[PDB]
Amino acid sequence: TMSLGAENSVAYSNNSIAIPTNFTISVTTEILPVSMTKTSVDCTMYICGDSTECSNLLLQYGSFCTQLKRALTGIAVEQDKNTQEVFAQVKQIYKTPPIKYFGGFNFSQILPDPSKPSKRSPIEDLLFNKVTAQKFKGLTVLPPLLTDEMIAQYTSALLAGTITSGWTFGAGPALQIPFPMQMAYRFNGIGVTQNVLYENQKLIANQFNSAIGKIQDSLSSTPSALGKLQDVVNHNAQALNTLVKQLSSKFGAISSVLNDIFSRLDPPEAEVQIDRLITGRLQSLQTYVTQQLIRAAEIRASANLAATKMSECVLGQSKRVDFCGKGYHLMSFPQSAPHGVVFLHVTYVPAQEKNFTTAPAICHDGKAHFPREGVFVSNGTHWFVTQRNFYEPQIITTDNTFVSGNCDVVIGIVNNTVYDP
Amino acid sequence: SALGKLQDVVNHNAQALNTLVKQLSSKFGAISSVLNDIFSRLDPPEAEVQIDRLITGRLQSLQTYVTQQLIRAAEIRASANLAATKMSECVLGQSKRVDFCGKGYHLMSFPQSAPHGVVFLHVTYVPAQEKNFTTAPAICHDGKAHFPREGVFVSNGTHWFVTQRNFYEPQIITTDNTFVSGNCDVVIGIVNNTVYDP
Amino acid sequence: GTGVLTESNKKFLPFQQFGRDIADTTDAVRDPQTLEILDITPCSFGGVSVITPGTNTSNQVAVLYQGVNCTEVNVFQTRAGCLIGAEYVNNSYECDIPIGAGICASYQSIIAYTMSLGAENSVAYSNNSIAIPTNFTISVTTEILPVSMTKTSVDCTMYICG
Amino acid sequence: GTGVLTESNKKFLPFQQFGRDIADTTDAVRDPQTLEILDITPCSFGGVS
Numbered sequence: 001t002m003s004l005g006a007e008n009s010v011a012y013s014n015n016s017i018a019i020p021t022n023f024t025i026s027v028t029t030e031i032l033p034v035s036m037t038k039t040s041v042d043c044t045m046y047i048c049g050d051s052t053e054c055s056n057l058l059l060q061y062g063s064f065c066t067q068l069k070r071a072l073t074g075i076a077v078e079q080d081k082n083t084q085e086v087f088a089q090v091k092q093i094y095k096t097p098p099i100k101y102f103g104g105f106n107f108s109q110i111l112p113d114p115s116k117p118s119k120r121s122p123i124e125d126l127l128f129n130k131v132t133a134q135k136f137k138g139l140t141v142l143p144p145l146l147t148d149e150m151i152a153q154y155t156s157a158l159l160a161g162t163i164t165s166g167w168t169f170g171a172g173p174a175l176q177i178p179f180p181m182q183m184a185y186r187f188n189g190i191g192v193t194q195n196v197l198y199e200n201q202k203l204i205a206n207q208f209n210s211a212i213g214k215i216q217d218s219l220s221s222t223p224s225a226l227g228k229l230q231d232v233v234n235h236n237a238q239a240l241n242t243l244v245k246q247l248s249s250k251f252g253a254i255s256s257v258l259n260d261i262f263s264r265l266d267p268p269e270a271e272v273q274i275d276r277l278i279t280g281r282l283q284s285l286q287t288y289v290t291q292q293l294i295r296a297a298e299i300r301a302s303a304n305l306a307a308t309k310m311s312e313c314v315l316g317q318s319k320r321v322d323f324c325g326k327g328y329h330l331m332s333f334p335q336s337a338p339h340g341v342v343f344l345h346v347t348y349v350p351a352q353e354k355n356f357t358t359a360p361a362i363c364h365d366g367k368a369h370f371p372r373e374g375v376f377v378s379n380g381t382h383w384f385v386t387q388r389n390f391y392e393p394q395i396i397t398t399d400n401t402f403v404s405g406n407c408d409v410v411i412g413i414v415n416n417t418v419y420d421p
Numbered sequence: 422s423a424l425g426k427l428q429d430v431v432n433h434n435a436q437a438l439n440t441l442v443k444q445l446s447s448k449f450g451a452i453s454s455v456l457n458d459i460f461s462r463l464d465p466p467e468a469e470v471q472i473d474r475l476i477t478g479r480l481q482s483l484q485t486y487v488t489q490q491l492i493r494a495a496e497i498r499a500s501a502n503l504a505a506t507k508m509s510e511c512v513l514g515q516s517k518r519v520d521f522c523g524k525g526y527h528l529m530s531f532p533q534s535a536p537h538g539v540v541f542l543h544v545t546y547v548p549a550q551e552k553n554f555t556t557a558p559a560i561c562h563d564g565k566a567h568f569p570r571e572g573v574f575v576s577n578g579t580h581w582f583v584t585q586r587n588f589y590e591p592q593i594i595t596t597d598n599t600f601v602s603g604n605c606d607v608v609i610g611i612v613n614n615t616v617y618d619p
Numbered sequence: 620g621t622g623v624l625t626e627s628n629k630k631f632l633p634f635q636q637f638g639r640d641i642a643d644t645t646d647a648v649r650d651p652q653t654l655e656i657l658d659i660t661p662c663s664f665g666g667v668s669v670i671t672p673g674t675n676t677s678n679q680v681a682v683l684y685q686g687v688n689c690t691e692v693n694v695f696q697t698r699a700g701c702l703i704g705a706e707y708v709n710n711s712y713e714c715d716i717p718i719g720a721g722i723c724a725s726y727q728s729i730i731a732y733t734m735s736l737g738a739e740n741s742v743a744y745s746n747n748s749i750a751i752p753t754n755f756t757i758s759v760t761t762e763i764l765p766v767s768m769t770k771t772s773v774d775c776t777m778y779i780c781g
Numbered sequence: 782g783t784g785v786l787t788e789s790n791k792k793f794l795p796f797q798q799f800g801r802d803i804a805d806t807t808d809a810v811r812d813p814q815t816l817e818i819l820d821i822t823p824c825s826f827g828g829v830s
C-alpha cells in the first residue's frame with residue numbers, strides 16, 4: 001500500500017511562533033515542450049503511387065486531399081507561431097559585457113561558450129546531447145522556420161538582458177544595474193530587507209554557484225529528467241510508423257498491391273476492389289490527421305503556458321505561489337532544448353527555524369503598540385521586533401511601532417516598556 | 422490586418438460550411454450524384470446499394486465536419502477563458518503580472534466590443550529619457566551603515582542623494598529615509614558621506 | 620515498377636531473391652541475367668510552393684521546390700529546398716514571407732535573405748553605475764481576442780437525403 | 782422536384798435551359814411552354830423547439 005507521505009505534526013499553540021534564522025538559495029528546473037515536428041503528406045502518391053488510373057478513380061471521391069493538406073498546413077504554421085510567441089519576446093539583442101564579474105556570482109554554466117562551434121552554453125549542450133528513417137511513401141518533415149542557432153541567440157539575449165538590467169528591459173528601455181543591487185531589490189521584493197543580502201553577499205554567491213553545479217550534475221546523471229521532450233519525439237515517430245505500416249493491410253481486399261490487382265482482374269471488380277483499398281487508406285489518413293490536430297492543440301496549450309512563464313518569471317519577479325518553482329521566487333534563467341524550453345528557477349528557501357513566544361501588541365502607558373512591519377518576539381525575558389522572514393531582533397521603539405487605542409480591547413496584549421529615542 | 426483574428430474566425434467557419442455544401446455534389450463512385458436520377462434509372466435491388474454507398478459517404482462527410490467544429494470550439498473556449506481572465510484582472514483591477522495587460526507597467530485598461538470577440542485598450546506607463554549615475558549600496562557615517570528605506574543612493578559626481586527607483590527625484594540623505602544596520606566594515610562597496618539629522 | 624537502380628552493398632543469401640523494407644515494398648532485387656544486387660530508389664519528388672508578393676503589387680513569383688537538391692531537377696539552394704526566381708542577398712531584414720530554416724523572402728524584384736534577428740544592442744554594465752529615468756510616456760495598446768464562434772445547426776434528413 | 786415557383790429576372794441566354802446553384806442542384810428552370818423563366822425555392826422548413 002503506497003505511503004501518503006512522512007507524518008509531521010507541528011507544535012501549534014496560541015502564543016508561540018517560529019522564525020527562520022538562515023536561508024538556502026535553491027535552483028530547480030522545469031521542462032516544457034513548445035513545438036512539435038511539422039509534417040506534410042503527399043496524398044496522390046501515398047494513396048496510390050505510380051498508378052494513374054488509380055488517381056483517376058480517386059478524383060471521383062472529392063477533395064479529401066485538399067482538406068488534409070489544409071489541416072496539415074495550419075498545424076505547420078501554428079508550430080512557428082508557438083515558437084515566435086515563446087521566444088521572440090525582446091526586439092533588441094543584448095550582449096553581456098566582456099568582463100564577467102558580477103559580484104561573485106558565476107554564470108559560466110548558462111552563458112554562451114565561444115569555444116563551442118555552435119555558441120551554446122554548457123547546460124544547453126548537455127540538453128541537446130541528452131535528447132535524440134527513409135519514408136518515400138510521401139511523408140515529409142518540414143524544417144522549422146527558426147534554426148537552433150537563432151533560438152540560442154534569443155536565449156543569450158534574454159540572459160544578458162536579465163543579468164545586466166534586471167527586469168527593467170522587459171517594460172521599456174534597458175537600464176543597467178549592478179548585480180548585487182538587483183539581488184537586494186529582489187530580496188526586498190519577497191519581504192527581506194537589503195541589509196540581509198549585503199551583509200552576507202559572499203555566502204549567497206557560494207550557495208548559488210554550488211546550486212548551479214548541482215543542477216548540471218543532476219541533469220548529466222539522470223536520464224529521465226527530460227521525459228516530456230522525448231515523449232513528444234516518440235509520439236510523433238510512432239504515429240508516422242503506424243501510418244507506414246497501415247499500407248500493408250488488404251482492408252478485406254483479396255490483395256494489397258496496386259499492380260497485382262490491376263494485372264489479375266478486369267475493371268468490373270477491380271474498380272470495387274480499388275474503391276475498398278482507397279477508402280481504407282483515406283480513413284487511415286483521416287485518423288492520422290485527427291490525432292495530429294488533437295496533439296497540436298495540447299502542444300499549443302503547453303506553449304502558451306511556457307510563454308506566460310517566460311513573460312512573468314524571467315522578465316520579472318512573480319509573487320504567485322509555486323508558479324516559478326517551490327519557495328519564494330527570486331529570478332529564473334531560460335535554456336533552449338529540442339522542441340522545448342528549460343527554466344532554471346532560482347528561489348529563496350528559509351531554514352534553521354527557531355521557536356519563540358509572541359504577543360499581538362504591547363501595552364505601555366495605557367496605549368497599545370502594534371508593529372509596523374515586523375512581529376513581536378521574546379527569547380524569554382526581553383521583547384524585540386523582527387521582520388517575519390528572518391530573525392533580526394530590534395529594540396522596540398516608537399518608530400517601528402504605531403499606537404492604536406488603549407490596551408483594554410486586544411486579547412493577549414502584554415506589558416512592556418517602549419524606548420523613546 | 423489589425424483585426425486578423427476575428428476575420429480568421431469568420432473565414433474558418435464560412436469556408437468549412439462551404440466545403441460541406443460543395444461536397445454534397447460528389448459522386449462517391451456512383452453512376453450519378455442525383456438520387457432522383459438514380460431512382461429513375463435502376464431497379465430497387467441495385468438502387469439500394471447505390472443509395473447505401475452515397476448515404477454512407479455523405480454521413481462520413483458530416484461526421485468529419487462535426488469533429489472539426491468540436492476542435493475549433495475547444496480552441497475558441499480556451500481563448501474565451503483567457504479573455505475572461507484578462508477582463509477580470511486588468512479591467513476590474515490593476516495587475517502586477519508582467520506583459521499580461523500590455524507592454525510596460527500596467528495602469529488600467531478599457532474593454533471594447535467586437536464581432537465574435539472583445540478588444541482591450543491597455544493603458545501603460547513606460548519610462549523614458551534615462552540618465553546614468555554612480556550608485557553605492559550603503560553610506561558609512563560615524564561607524565554606522567545606512568541603507569535606503571525605499572529609494573536608491575545616486576550621485577551626480579560630487580553630492581549623494583536618495584531617490585525612488587522608477588523616477589528621478591533626488592532628496593537629501595537624512596536619517597528619516599534611511600535605516601541603520603550594523604557597522605560599515607562588513608558590506609562591500611560602502612562609501613563615506615554625511616547624513617543630515619533634522 | 621519505377622525507380623532508380625543503383626549498385627547495392629546488400630549481400631543476401633543465394634536462395635534469397637528479393638528484398639523488402641519496413642513498409643513491405645521491394646527495395647532490393649537481383650538481376651536474372653547476371654547474379655548481382657541492385658537497390659530500388661524512387662525517383663526524386665517533392666512539393667512545390669509559390670512565393671507571391673500579391674497580385675495587387677506584381678505578377679512575379681518565386682517557385683520553391685521542397686527538399687530537393689536542384690542539381691537533380693537566379694537559383695538558390697536552401698535547407699528547405701532549391702529556390703528559383705529570387706536572388707540571395709547578403710543583407711538582413713525582418714521576415715516578410717517565411718521560407719524555412721531561417722530564410723525569408725520579400726519584394727522590393729523578389730529577394731531572399733537571412734532574416735534579421737533583431738536590432739543589435741549592448742548595454743553599458745558596470746559595478747558602480749546605475750541608470751534612472753527622468754521622464755515617462757503613457758502608452759496605449761490594443762489586444763483582440765475572439766470569444767465565441769457562430770452557432771450552427773444541421774438538418775439530417777434535409778442534407779443526407781433531398 | 783418540390784418547391785415554390787416564382788417569376789425570375791435571371792437572363793438566360795437563348796440556348797440555355799436550366800440553372801445551377803453552387804451545390805449543382807437546379808435552381809432556375811425554363812418551362813417547355815410559353816418559354817418562361819422561373820426560380821425553384823424549397824418550401825418553408827426549420828427546427829422545432
Ligand SMILES: *[C@@H]1O[C@H](CO)[C@@H](O[C@@H]2O[C@H](CO)[C@@H](O)[C@H](O)[C@H]2NC(C)=O)[C@H](O)[C@H]1NC(C)=O
Binds near residue numbers: 009010011353355356
Ligand atoms: C520549539 O518548541 C516546541 C515546544 O517547546 C517544540 O515542539 C516540540 O518539538 C520536539 C522536538 O522533537 C517534539 O518531540 C515535541 O513533540 C514538540 N512538541 C509538540 C507539542 O509537538 C519545537 O520543536 C521547537 N522548535 C524547534 C525548531 O526545535
Ligand SMILES: *[C@@H]1O[C@H](CO)[C@@H](O[C@@H]2O[C@H](CO)[C@@H](O)[C@H](O)[C@H]2NC(C)=O)[C@H](O)[C@H]1NC(C)=O
Binds near residue numbers: 024
Ligand atoms: C547559515 O547556513 C550556512 C550554510 O547553509 C552556514 O554556512 C556554513 O558555516 C559553517 C560554519 O561557519 C561552515 O563550515 C560551512 O562551510 C558554511 N557553509 C557554506 C556553504 O559556506 C552559516 O554559518 C549559517 N549561518 C548561521 C548564522 O548559522
Ligand SMILES: *[C@@H]1O[C@H](CO)[C@@H](O[C@@H]2O[C@H](CO)[C@@H](O)[C@H](O)[C@H]2NC(C)=O)[C@H](O)[C@H]1NC(C)=O
Binds near residue numbers: 106107108
Ligand atoms: C566559474 O565557474 C567555472 C566552472 O565551474 C570555473 O571554471 C573552472 O576553473 C578552474 C580553474 O580556473 C578549472 O580547474 C575548472 O576546470 C573550471 N571548470 C570547468 C567546468 O571548466 C571558474 O573558475 C569559475 N569562476 C570564474 C570567475 O569564472
Ligand SMILES: *[C@@H]1O[C@H](CO)[C@@H](O[C@@H]2O[C@H](CO)[C@@H](O)[C@H](O)[C@H]2NC(C)=O)[C@H](O)[C@H]1NC(C)=O
Binds near residue numbers: 379380381382
Ligand atoms: C534575550 O536577549 C537579550 C538581549 O540580547 C539578552 O540580554 C542580554 O544578554 C547578554 C547575555 O547574557 C548580556 O551580556 C546582556 O547584558 C543582556 N542585556 C541586557 C540589557 O540585559 C537576554 O539575556 C536574552 N535572554 C536569554 C534567556 O538568553
Ligand SMILES: *[C@@H]1O[C@H](CO)[C@@H](O[C@@H]2O[C@H](CO)[C@@H](O)[C@H](O)[C@H]2NC(C)=O)[C@H](O)[C@H]1NC(C)=O
Binds near residue numbers: 363414415
Ligand atoms: C499591565 O499594567 C497594568 C497597569 O500598570 C496592570 O493593571 C493593573 O493590574 C493590577 C493587577 O490586577 C491591578 O491591581 C491594578 O488595578 C491594574 N491597574 C490598572 C491601571 O489597570 C496590568 O495588570 C498589567 N498586565 C499584567 C498582565 O499584569
Ligand SMILES: *[C@@H]1O[C@H](CO)[C@@H](O[C@@H]2O[C@H](CO)[C@@H](O)[C@H](O)[C@H]2NC(C)=O)[C@H](O)[C@H]1NC(C)=O
Binds near residue numbers: 577579580
Ligand atoms: C550635483 O547636484 C548638487 C545639488 O543640486 C549640486 O550642488 C549645487 O550646484 C548648484 C549649481 O552648480 C549650486 O548653485 C548649488 O549651490 C550647489 N549646492 C550645494 C549645496 O553645493 C552639484 O553642483 C551637482 N554636481 C554637478 C557636477 O553638477
Ligand SMILES: *[C@@H]1O[C@H](CO)[C@@H](O[C@@H]2O[C@H](CO)[C@@H](O)[C@H](O)[C@H]2NC(C)=O)[C@H](O)[C@H]1NC(C)=O
Binds near residue numbers: 561612613
Ligand atoms: C571612510 O572613512 C573611514 C573613517 O573616516 C576611513 O577609515 C580610515 O582610513 C585611514 C586610511 O585608510 C586610516 O588611517 C584610519 O585609521 C581609518 N579610520 C577608521 C576609523 O577606520 C576610510 O579609509 C574611509 N574610506 C574611504 C574610501 O574614504
Ligand SMILES: *[C@@H]1O[C@H](CO)[C@@H](O[C@@H]2O[C@H](CO)[C@@H](O)[C@H](O)[C@H]2NC(C)=O)[C@H](O)[C@H]1NC(C)=O
Binds near residue numbers: 551552554
Ligand atoms: C552613461 O555613461 C556611460 C559611460 O560613461 C555610457 O556608456 C557608454 O555609452 C556610449 C554611448 O554611445 C557607448 O558608445 C559606450 O560604449 C558606453 N560605454 C561602455 C563601457 O559600454 C552610457 O551610455 C551613459 N548613459 C546614457 C543614457 O547615455
Ligand SMILES: *[C@@H]1O[C@H](CO)[C@@H](O[C@@H]2O[C@H](CO)[C@@H](O)[C@H](O)[C@H]2NC(C)=O)[C@H](O)[C@H]1NC(C)=O
Binds near residue numbers: 753754755756
Ligand atoms: C517629458 O516628455 C514630454 C513629452 O514626451 C515633454 O513635454 C514636451 O515639452 C516640450 C518642451 O516644453 C514641448 O515643446 C512639448 O510640446 C511637450 N510635449 C507634450 C506632449 O506636451 C516633457 O518636457 C518631458 N519632461 C521633461 C522634464 O523634460
Ligand SMILES: *[C@@H]1O[C@H](CO)[C@@H](O)[C@H](O)[C@H]1NC(C)=O
Binds near residue numbers: 013014412
Ligand atoms: C490558549 O491555549 C490554551 C491551550 O491551547 C487554552 O487553554 C487557552 O484558553 C488559550 N487562550 C487564548 C487566549 O487563546
Ligand SMILES: *[C@@H]1O[C@H](CO)[C@@H](O)[C@H](O)[C@H]1NC(C)=O
Binds near residue numbers: 652653654
Ligand atoms: C546469358 O546468355 C548470354 C548469351 O545469350 C551469355 O553470353 C551469358 O554468359 C549468359 N549469362 C550467364 C550469367 O550465363
Ligand SMILES: *[C@@H]1O[C@H](CO)[C@@H](O)[C@H](O)[C@H]1NC(C)=O
Binds near residue numbers: 099101747
Ligand atoms: C568593479 O569591477 C572592476 C573590474 O571589472 C574591479 O576592478 C573593481 O574592483 C570592481 N569594483 C568593486 C567595488 O567590486
Ligand SMILES: *[C@@H]1O[C@H](CO)[C@@H](O)[C@H](O)[C@H]1NC(C)=O
Binds near residue numbers: 814
Ligand atoms: C402552345 O403553347 C401555348 C402556350 O401558352 C398555348 O397557348 C397553345 O395553345 C399551344 N398550342 C397548341 C396547338 O396546343
